Ubiquitin carboxyl-terminal hydrolase 7
Amino acid sequence: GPLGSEAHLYMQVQIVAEDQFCGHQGNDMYDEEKVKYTVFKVLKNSSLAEFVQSLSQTMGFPQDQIRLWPMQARSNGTKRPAMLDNEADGNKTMIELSDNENPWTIFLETVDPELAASGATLPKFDKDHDVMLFLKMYDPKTRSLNYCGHIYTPISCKIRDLLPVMCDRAGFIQDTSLILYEEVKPNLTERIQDYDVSLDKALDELMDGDIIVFQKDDPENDNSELPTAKEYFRDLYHRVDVIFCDKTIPNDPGFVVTLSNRMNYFQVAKTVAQRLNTDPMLLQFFKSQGYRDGPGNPLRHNYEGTLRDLLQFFKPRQPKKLYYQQLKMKITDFENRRSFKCIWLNSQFREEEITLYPDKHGCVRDLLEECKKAVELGEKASGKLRLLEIVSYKIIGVHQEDELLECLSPATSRTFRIEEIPLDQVDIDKENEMLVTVAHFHKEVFGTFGIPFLLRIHQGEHFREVMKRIQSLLDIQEKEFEKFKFAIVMMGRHQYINEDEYEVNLKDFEPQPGNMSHPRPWLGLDHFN
């Protein structure tokens, strides 16, 4: 709103008291958004000595019984209390001491009120030989930080001489072995390896407002998921909330899961599966799309990246969200299944469309048995299935059960038909019988149509026996059947068979001896549809 005429002469001073440090679970002393201050509107050019006296009066302590430690930013990104020399700077202005920072935050150290009632006085601080250190206790069992206050200590004090104070402030029995760290910055908790050296040597760049975090040295620490403070702070640094949604449930708001940015695929899958009460291998996940919300490409189960890689495209505004779905087979089998579309020719000689799901590494036999488990075979029939390949309404191949599915043509030209073998064809007499392919056409043999079939024929047979086999299979009226002409077709050359002279010689339907590749002769039926 309207700034007053002199507003440019005033700055905000935020005073934080030590009770604001208690309960903080993060790095540094407090969370900048949860911290409660005492706020002062102070002239920029008023003196530090003025402020110290006025504040002592306001907060209710004798001026000797308090000390100011400005909260100061460090190059590594942390914010820590720093020493302020009141006697030597008492005449400097507030804005020059604040380094033009506005608002300016200051930690106000006071004596404990009740303990001060005992006549206790704020000890004196030798700026040249003393350091103010802050203490935190890490409890692995509850996985929590417990604020343990601060201490004045000579730079020359040995780390080992500080262990009694840590034990006493944490409530540990004296001579409890301890592990000690410096909390340098988020994701850097450096263990202190030698307690028999001075603070100056144990800590690199020893300053006021440094932080030692300690914990019991206890076998039971290993029972916790975060046994050390180092791991606690690493986990804290890498924590991230992610919303998971089932992509097969429309407008699903999903549920939140707390994860770590450095989990691999398996850890993420483990966590989400435990909270869905399903097997981890029964889930499929999806990368993000980036710009537009909604699931993206499926995530291969052997993904080698981290959760951070999967989330890297969410801007600070967008809610982190991933998409999954639940499966009925293990993810490795789901990724490996091939959708094989084929025709099932039923016992009534009618086509049905069926999609089977064999493993992409399977053979023809796996496909045939997948289909057999799905259909209703003939009344009293062979109970054996065969797989044909049809192109332009002609049977061009019969595939043996050992061929790999990868060998079959994926071209959409090919129609693959599964059919029950008729009983006269399960085991033909190989010296006088033969299976020939039959296909319908009209005029030139180029124009094929209809349902082709395999037909058993016998040497020496009369051709009207062949026509009656054909007629019984085909199943139409005699008026249509009589019109049918018949031919033997080979390599674009066809000659017509005399229906009433009956010559059936296997040699006329055989390829050149030794040749199994050449498209074999076949029996062409001549009519119209």
Q: What stands out?
A: Residues 236-334 form a domain with the Ubiquitin-like (UB roll) fold (CATH 3.10.20.90).
